[PDB]
């Protein structure tokens, strides 16, 4: 991952997202509700100390279970680190705040999201998207439909 | 991790558990209730088909919550793969199936725990532990007693 975010504002991020498309290096890490990185972002909360909560759902044991996680900043402004077993790392590589926003999630071992403030198929967001997957190697994508992105878990 | 258990019956590793010990290679994986790898095994469910099944307790976003991760069976019996975005061990190091159990969880980076049948300290098996953490490069070790033992969460 060589895109990142240049002059990212972190307090800018926070409010509704919808996570409109994934990809990810390995097919079992998106395949099934149940994948390990097959998460639903609901909201970004940066932190005063401009660490960045993430409020997500994800299927686990047959529910959609809400999750929150707190990825810490970095001294790099669009790097942030999770602390569980593998080192953990969430890049933010593009937003303009009021549409779109790309982030992956690293370590090697990649998912990327292509998030939107809107329930919408935003084809300018998704051609961003797909332009820095092409610097990666994925071989898993998903996308959903609006109606998809109403519901608990994108049933 | 050079120690797994020759001729382990996984059928019998079924039940209840106690999580008596924990230690692990970084502070950071079990310091907080919310650690990483700080995780209170409840039951052991070996499937059918010869993957097991834990029941465990996290401390997560204030709550203690049940979870039921699947460790799926590898060509080697004592070793087991869960499906994370890095590639997760668990390892059967020992057992005697009737008091005591010890298992790791690795990838380098590893947690192991001294399980017990009972809410009981058992001096022989935290002998055992401690024989094989000998062995790891572990720089953080809990242990709980027997009122902590019986609570959600070890409280």
Redesign the interface.
């Known amino acids: 991952v060589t895109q990142t975010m240049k002059g990212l504002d972190i307090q800018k991020v926070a409010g509704t997202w919808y996570s409109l498309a994934m990809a990810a290096s390995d097919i ?2 998106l395949d099934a509700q149940s ?3 097959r998460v639903y972002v609901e909201e970004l909360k940066p932190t005063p100390e401009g660490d960045l909560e993430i409020l997500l759902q994800k299927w ?2 047959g529910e959609c279970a809400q ?2 996680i707190i990825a810490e900043k970095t001294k790099i402004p669009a790097v942030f680190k999770i ?4 080192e ?1 790392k969430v890049l933010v590589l593009d937003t303009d705040y009021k549409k779109y926003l790309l982030l992956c ?1 690293e ?1 090697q ?1 990649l ?1 990327c999201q292509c998030l939107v403030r809107t329930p919408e198929v935003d084809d300018e967001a998704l051609e961003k998207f797909d332009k820095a997957l092409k610097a990666l190697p994925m071989h898993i994508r998903l996308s959903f439909n609006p109606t998809q992105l109403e519901e608990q878990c994108h049933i």
Chains 1, 2 share one sequence.
């Open positions: 079992s890490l994948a390990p990185l686990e044991n999750k929150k602390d569980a077993l593998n953990n999630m370590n071992s998912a």
